Design a protein around this ligand. Structure first.
Ligand code: PLP
Ligand code: PLP
Lengths: 420, 442
């Protein structure tokens, strides 16, 4: 039970100072308690609390956010459909990516390819593209049109294979799954730049360079899911430019408003923009609260804060290096096999031994603990099975990292004992 | 800046439910402000909105209490998970309140980010309640043609807008659709009651083809908002309750539009003595002040899905929505709307019923529609009636009224706060708008 929260810190009812290294839920990228946000939300609910997002008319809070996103991501992205959540964004992407192919006269290109252990929402669509299997479990989920493939989890799958060749491989597991559905039946492949909720699953640097080749030889679209990775998480404003990707569609959410408002949307490449506006008809997809003005206001201010105050540029050039390098330092711990991270996200692997390397029978019970001990030691840290992870706000300081490591290293040293 | 705002809107901003292209030339209507039942666009024109914007602004605009609680809840923590939370979190209230104003048997509620998201969950858990009752073959949900139940890939499969399916093979497994009770557009002569029984017994018709063992549930909006204001012969709903019993299936009444006073009563279920098993609500749950929706869960299905099956809501939006319901009950907004102004508006809408171009004038509560027709007593429909309403809208907006065209059906759903003097404005504004459209053809 928390009373207050400011910057990167939380305080519970007993005074308990807690460093939220989890940005709450991957989103609070400015940190808690930048009142600049509640003022503009208070003040925009005044003029217009709500008006329709385009059915007849538009409204300014949304046009402004639209420019800003056209601006942090101008490149080939200069258009944004809005929506009420990040899962609701992927529903949009799935339907319009099928509309794109329809208008080019290929209604058979309607299969989108995801990956096992991807997360792409909670809706019926979004849970079907995601490969958690715990959201598929209700019977019929992978709705027709969805196929899934290999995740590039170098550590949990093939800990020995040359990381470079393991990347190159598991990238061709896409070129595999194409010649057996049929290129002409595939509309697109969809990935998170870095799988977040599935573990901080970082591809070998070989993976993405491959997957781009594969969407060239073949006539299919790329859908990079920047919902967690977006707005500084990878040091860069978006993962697509850490991984030199030129997506066709991007769902975004969460850090769009640093979690302070229900809001998401899909950016649209100038490629798939062209086909939808011209040579196109009515787009009967749409959604009340799409560019809801209050959230658009809050989100506009949120991005406005981030570039004006230079929050992400510091995070990526000043602090991301420091965090990643200190994280690897826990790599030399008896309980830690691999230490991963790009930018402002990272993960530790909980393992029984290092030199002969044996998993736990049920690694979840260990990680499920080790987090509950980080909180009890003043640090929030998600557990995915036996993987521990952090996704801090981008306003962390070079001192708040020394805090986070030293608190993590205590939490690890403590976890070892209760087993031994 | 208009000239400039409109530039940017086409330049990058995208635009739910719109050609994208036939409106980048013509420019967008940019609305800056709003208070009461009025909006103001960039040219400062006052517009009377009898559409609650999009059926939601049941409070009427510019209600200060809502921004004050939103400013205040942003001060506490966003999200409310299990390990830590905001003391006295808004989500807890709202479920107590939402339980109080809901046909009794609904005493559990699950929150979600929209009304479409809500209908997905309901699709998920309706099959999940049958699984746990050992009938996993019970998976078919049944909507009606021209119904609207959301815009997620689930919602668009569930809604009988045939314009969203044909673009591909979208209506996903497990979804069938049936006749709508549009007495005017299907059987304008048939006895209004007989059509209701016939379009309702068309449900016992489908199940006799599919197999009772396949249908999981039935779903309708008490009245279909969108597709028109397609109000059922008073015979209809008493049938569907019968058909839904002897057949062992769940009822999903969709109260997103029809919910929170829109039909004079708090909900449509109330007005039609329906006892939904699942209720998606999300338009006027916060009177549009903030994105949020959810599902009510009848005590029946709530015991199977919550209990020995313990598996499977933004806090700031929960607060706003909680206070919106508060205001509406304390200040009797919905009680008056249904007893003072609803009978009143329901009379004078029927007046426009006999302008030279009106065949039917339909209405319940603070919702209602009329039908646009070529000749009245000779009875004729328009060739491409959509082109017609397209005009009557632009003339209603320029005559200062937001009045909505679904094909050839003109609709209004003003805030519940409309005053008896404000209907005269809306009636006269519409009446002028009507004689304006009559000339542009005749
Ligand atoms: C990759 C990805 N896509 C979509 C989502 C949708 O989540 P939500 O519905 O909370 O916006 C998530 C959120 O992290 C995600 O990680
Ligand atoms: C019955 C019903 N469900 C859902 C919706 C809309 O869903 P959402 O609020 O998520 O856009 C509407 C109208 O748009 C509706 O009338």
């Amino acid at each position: 039970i928390i009373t207050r929260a400011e910057g990167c810190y939380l305080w519970d009812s007993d005074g308990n100072q807690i460093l939220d290294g989890m940005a709450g839920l991957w989103c609070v990228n400015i940190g808690y308690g930048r009142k600049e946000l509640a003022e503009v939300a208070y003040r925009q609910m005044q003029e217009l609390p709500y008006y329709n997002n385009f059915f007849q008319c538009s409204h300014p809070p949304a046009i402004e956010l639209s420019r800003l996103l056209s601006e942090v991501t101008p490149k080939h992205m200069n258009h944004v459909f809005f929506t009420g959540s990040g899962s609701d964004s992927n529903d949009t992407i799935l339907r319009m990516v099928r509309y794109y192919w329809k208008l080019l006269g290929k209604p058979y290109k309607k299969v989108v390819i995801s990956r096992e252990n991807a997360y792409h929402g909670s809706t019926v669509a979004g849970a079907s593209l995601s490969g958690m299997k715990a959201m598929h479990s209700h019977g019929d989920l992978p709705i027709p049109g969805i196929e899934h493939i290999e995740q590039p989890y170098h550590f949990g799958r093939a800990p020995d294979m040359d990381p470079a060749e393991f990347g190159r491989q598991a990238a061709q597991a896409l070129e595999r799954k194409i010649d057996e559905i049929g290129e002409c039946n595939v509309a697109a492949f969809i990935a998170e730049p870095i799988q977040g909720a599935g573990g901080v699953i970082i591809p070998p640097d070989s993976y993405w360079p491959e997957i781009k080749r594969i969407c060239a030889e073949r006539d299919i679209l790329l859908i990079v899911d920047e919902v967690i990775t977006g707005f500084g998480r990878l040091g860069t404003w978006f993962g697509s430019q850490y991984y030199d990707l030129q997506p066709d569609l991007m769902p975004i959410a969460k850090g769009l408003s640093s979690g302070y408002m229900p809001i998401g949307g899909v950016m649209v490449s100038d490629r798939v923009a062209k086909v939808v506006i011209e040579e196109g008809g009515e787009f009967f997809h749409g959604y009340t609260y799409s560019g809801h003005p209050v959230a658009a206001a809050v989100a506009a201010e949120n991005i406005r804060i981030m570039r004006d105050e230079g929050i992400i540029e510091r995070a990526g050039a000043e602090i991301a290096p420091y965090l990643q390098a200190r994280w690897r330092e826990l790599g030399e711990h008896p309980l830690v096999g691999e230490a991963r991270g790009v930018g402002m996200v990272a993960a530790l692997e909980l393992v029984k031994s290092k030199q002969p390397l044996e998993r736990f029978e049920e690694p979840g019970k260990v990680g499920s603990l080790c987090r509950d001990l980080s909180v009890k030691n003043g640090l929030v840290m998600r557990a995915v099975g036996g993987t521990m992870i952090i996704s801090p706000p981008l306003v962390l300081s070079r001192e708040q990292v020394d805090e986070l490591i030293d608190k993590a290293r205590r939490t690890l040293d403590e976890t070892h004992k209760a087993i031994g």
